[PDB]
Design a protein around this nucleic acid. Structure first.
Lengths: 151, 141, 129, 262, 149
RNA sequence: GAAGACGGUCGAACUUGACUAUCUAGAGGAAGUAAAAGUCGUAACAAGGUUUCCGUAGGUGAACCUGCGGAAGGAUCAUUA
RNA sequence: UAAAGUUGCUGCAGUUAAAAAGCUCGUAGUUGGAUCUCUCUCGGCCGAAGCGUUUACUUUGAAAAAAUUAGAGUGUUCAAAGCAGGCCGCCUGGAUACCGCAGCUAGGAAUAAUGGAAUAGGACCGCGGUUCUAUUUUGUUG
RNA sequence: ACGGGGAAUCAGGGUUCGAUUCCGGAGAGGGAGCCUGAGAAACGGCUACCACAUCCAAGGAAGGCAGCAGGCGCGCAAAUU
């Protein structure tokens, strides 16, 4: 697919893609190295990140974002922006006078890289905290676990 | 019966909070209408100007003239009626002089056989009614 | 519908013991019911009981020895820490000399004294005295 | 507030300074220096409150302005100078030397050391980095920078600095079986052998320390300071050797001391 | 009690304690499976197949002879119906009630019973969607549900 | 290199709009409360002298009356092949 | 504020004293029957890894200003207080606990939720097929 | 309604309070805009407008106590220039 759907050229800023080509420099292939990094904390770089072609500067694996801070989990509830999803974290808040709990939830707008295709509503996502990416986004989707019902 | 579930805290707290408004004292304290209607405006005492001496008839089972005064409060220009407690103490009050009035002791309710009167005079002309009654002090000249 | 089969079992035992009956039938049986009954019996409060095995959900015939004043359930199963145990004992037990609060802890189902011995907390199932 | 603060309230001061609640409104705000505000001991507190050499801050000022106090071998005339862990305070006029070392209660002790021990100190290396033509540099807990350190010295190790020259002489690796003090937290002032280190990536590592008396405790890796190689300290320890007694044992010792004394 | 009635009836089957094949019963498990296949090919629901096997062939319980339930056998052979028979019969009853209500518009009792039937339909359909027995987009609409019948 | 000027931007400002403010211009209109009930009746409490009450509708100096359906909290737990 | 179990979570009431919707259906909310008991470099089966099934709960360990409250010591002449002081230069204190919820950590695995194998694109096992594969050339790479 | 540490009361639960000396935030009559500086949108700095207000020879000049005292006003309500 064409990765150049923007008014400006999309590229990985750390990759030089027009190193000089000559007869010896080209033998039936142009070649294009792919910048990717191994984020920490045991998270493995998805295969599509390594062998993909998308340009996403907020992607944890091939972009310019450092995963540091809280590592949370949520359930995907809305996928209707570009490269951003809304997940819902459900918890119980303890009211002490009644010695009981009440259901509460918080929505979280988190960045989803193009490396995670086939993400559905109800999927569980492990997200990691990064620097502010937009007005409301501060977490990047690190891992996707499909909801029970995969067959 | 009532709900007994580990996740009913919202239900219990909200039901208690809604049902507290049917408590007359809680509603009177937290609605703000009573504070607005209170001539003292939340104060324990208030200074006022005596407009006239008024005699209030005791309620039907009893029979007397309760010697009160109509006063206008300096703070808000409201007109109240205040009992002059002891005997001969109405003679200690003139017209158009300043009096300190307090509540009558029921937190805004009438006391005894004095209809519609919920205040009592404490001072007159910056001298307490007790001092004038006991002769310890005299009103200024 | 019926929730809390242990509540039904305890209410049945209580109602039968208050009528002075010698045995009580409990249905359905469950592991929690059997453990609660075992705790009651180890302290001499009920006596022997038989688990009738039908292929759906067993029944229990509990022999009653009239030493039981009240066996009750605590719903919901509040989580109880070792600090809150004294307050629960004051609330539920008739005396500090006798009576037991039954907890389900990770070490099993046990009375409150045994939970203090193992230095563990858990969830309150009920009480008996 | 605009700009930095310049005052410290008496009640908001670090508790281990052991200041009153009636001798004024302010505590001496320690100057910026090699040690943090809440982990230091100002020179005025040491000279007045600890050693009783002065009865007022004016007398501390007189003592310090006569150039009588050396801190790590250098004369300090700043009465609010932040002196901290492992530092050496020399008073040559009275011919004494002290090391700033925590008590088991978490408070800097008046720990006198020999004049030959006052020639060195121990510093925990906070970071190591290569700069400017590949020269390695090392930064310790005194905020002092040492160029060309041994390529074996890493973060969390301890190095013995010669105060006269400022150069490294020896070093202790951070490893199990090594003696260490605790320099923060609940176990502050305790000494023991490192037994384990739980690594928590992306978070704080936890180091387990076993006392000389069989007691065990844990701290954050930033709260550990390697004192000696093996179970032999490289510095003289305070009266208590880092053994935190329970309140009962302390009461028993106090009663025994009362019986022996009166 | 009933889900949609004040009835508190107790009438139901009472399985015997023994889970074994009766001594009188000489049909092999495969014989019961082929009889089930024949009855299903005839166009019968699993309840009807079980009733016929109990009444005529003496099969007290198919699960105890074949080690499998009738619907599971029908699915495994590949001739189980598209939607479960309880939901199918509920939809059929709803269709009948709607057909009656089309020509009898003054029957408020029929409208009330239709409401009850469709509530039961929706509850069962939600349960089936939870179990992935029905597609998640399946919905009961009362416009062409007679085709589902 | 000062005054000054164009433009930009931030932007306080007598912006030509709905005055939740008790206060008064209120004579006003219709309602609640202790009435020498003063007067006129007696609707309810006894089968209260037309059993009472509920909903709805009309009518009336006034309590109320009347129609339709309902309840007993009735003045019937009962009336006989 | 207690008394007020007259706001009732503990812990209230609702036939007649104030009070249960005219009656059903119904989404959210709340609540839900039984059931499952020896694996990475080692010089101590003798340092280690999890790559495997998640939480709630409970216990523990870190980290968590002081002042206040609780609380140890100490004859302010006593006490409220204070953090002092004690002995004939010396001796000694300036403790300790609690710090809820959320976050971090490590044991337990009853209780409660949750998960896999049902068109087997299921577990283990050896076979058929592909890669510069940080060396599988002390020799100048080829 | 500045928030918290915390306070009063309290058998176990709880109720009410926290302007107030410690920590954090905000403001300096109300808004706004800046200079200097490491640090201020600072007011015991400046610039303007709005409100108030001081001196004047009418040309002009100057202002900001929610700092310590003190005064007036306000009030039931709070101290020494």
């Amino acid at each position: 697919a064409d990765i150049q759907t923007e008014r400006a050229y999309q590229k990985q800023p750390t990759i030089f893609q027009n190193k000089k080509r000559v007869l010896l420099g080209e033998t039936g292939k142009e070649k294009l190295p792919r910048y990717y990094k191994n984020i920490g904390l045991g998270f493995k770089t998805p295969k599509e990140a390594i062998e993909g072609t998308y340009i996403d500067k907020k992607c944890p694996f091939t972009g310019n974002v450092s995963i540091r801070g809280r590592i949370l989990s949520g359930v995907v509830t809305k996928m209707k922006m570009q490269r951003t999803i809304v997940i819902r974290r459900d918890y119980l808040h303890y009211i002490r006078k009644y010695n009981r709990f009440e259901k509460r939830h918080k929505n979280m707008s988190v960045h989803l890289s193009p490396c995670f295709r086939d993400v559905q509503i109800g999927d569980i996502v492990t997200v990691g905290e990064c620097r502010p990416l937009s007005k409301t986004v501060r977490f990047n989707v690190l891992k996707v676990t499909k909801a029970a019902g995969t067959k | 019966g009532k709900c007994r579930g580990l996740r009913t805290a919202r239900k219990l707290r909200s039901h208690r909070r809604d049902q507290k408004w049917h408590d007359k004292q809680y509603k009177k304290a937290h609605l703000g209408t009573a504070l607005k209607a209170n001539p003292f405006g939340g104060a324990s005492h208030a200074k006022g100007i005596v407009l006239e001496k008024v005699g209030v008839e005791a309620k039907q089972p009893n029979s007397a003239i309760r010697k009160c005064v109509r006063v206008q409060l300096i703070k808000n220009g409201k007109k109240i009626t205040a009992f002059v407690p002891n005997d001969g103490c109405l003679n200690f009050i003139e017209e158009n002089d300043e009096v300190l009035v307090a509540g009558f002791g029921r937190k805004g309710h009438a006391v005894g056989d004095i209809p519609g009167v919920r205040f009592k005079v404490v001072k007159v002309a910056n001298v307490s009614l007790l001092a004038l009654y006991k002769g310890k002090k005299e009103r200024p000249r | 519908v019926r929730m809390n089969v242990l509540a039904d079992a305890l209410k049945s035992i209580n109602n039968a013991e208050k009528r002075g009956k010698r045995q009580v039938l409990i249905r359905p049986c469950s592991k929690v019911i059997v453990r609660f009954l075992t705790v009651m019996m180890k302290h001499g409060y009920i006596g022997e009981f038989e688990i009738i095995d039908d292929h759906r959900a067993g029944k229990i015939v509990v022999n009653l020895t009239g030493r039981l004043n009240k066996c009750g359930v605590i719903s919901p199963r509040f989580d109880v820490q070792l600090k809150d145990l004294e307050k629960w004992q004051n609330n539920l037990l008739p005396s500090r000399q006798f009576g037991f609060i039954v907890l389900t802890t990770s070490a099993g189902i046990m009375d409150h004294e045994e939970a203090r011995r193992k230095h563990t907390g858990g969830k309150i199932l009920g009480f008996f005295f | 507030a605009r700009g930095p603060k310049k005052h410290l309230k008496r009640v908001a001061a670090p508790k281990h300074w052991m200041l009153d609640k009636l001798t004024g409104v302010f505590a001496p705000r320690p100057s910026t220096g090699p040690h943090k505000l809440r982990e230091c001991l100002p020179l005025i507190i040491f000279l007045r409150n600890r050693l009783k050499y002065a009865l007022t801050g004016d007398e501390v000022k007189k003592i310090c302005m006569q150039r009588f106090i050396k801190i790590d071998g250098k004369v300090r005339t700043d009465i609010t100078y932040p002196a901290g862990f492992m530092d050496v305070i020399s008073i040559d006029k009275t011919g004494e030397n002290f090391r700033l070392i925590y008590d088991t209660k978490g408070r800097f002790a008046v720990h006198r050391i020999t004049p030959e021990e006052a020639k060195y100190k121990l510093c925990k290396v906070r970071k190591i980095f290569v700069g400017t033509k590949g020269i390695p540099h090392l930064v310790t807990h005194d905020a002092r920078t040492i160029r060309y350190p041994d390529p074996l010295i890493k973060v969390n190790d301890t190095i013995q600095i010669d105060l006269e020259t400022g150069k490294i002489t020896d070093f202790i690796k951070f490893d199990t079986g090594n003696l260490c003090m605790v320099t923060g937290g609940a176990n502050l002032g305790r000494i023991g052998v490192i037994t384990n280190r739980e690594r928590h990536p992306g978070s704080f590592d936890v180091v387990h320390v076993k006392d000389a008396n069989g007691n065990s405790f844990a701290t954050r890796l930033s709260n550990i300071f390697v004192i000696g190689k093996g179970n032999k300290p490289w510095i003289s320890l305070p009266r208590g050797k880092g053994i935190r007694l329970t309140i009962a044992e302390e009461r028993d010792k106090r009663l025994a001391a009362k019986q022996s004394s009166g | 009690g009933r889900m949609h009635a004040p009835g508190k009836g107790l009438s139901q089957s009472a399985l015997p304690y023994r889970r074994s094949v009766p001594t009188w019963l000489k049909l092999t498990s495969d014989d019961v499976k082929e009889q089930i296949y024949k009855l299903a090919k005839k166009g019968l629901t699993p309840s009807q197949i079980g009733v016929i096997l109990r009444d005529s062939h003496g099969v007290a319980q198919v699960r105890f002879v074949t080690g499998n339930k009738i619907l599971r056998i029908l699915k495994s052979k590949g001739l189980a119906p598209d939607l479960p028979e309880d939901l199918y019969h509920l939809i059929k009853k709803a269709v009948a009630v709607r057909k009656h209500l089309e020509r009898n518009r003054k029957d408020k009792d029929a409208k009330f019973r239709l409401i009850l039937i469709e509530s039961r339909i929706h509850r069962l359909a939600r349960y089936y969607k939870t179990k992935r027995v029905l597609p998640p987009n399946w919905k009961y609409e009362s416009s062409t549900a007679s085709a589902l019948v």
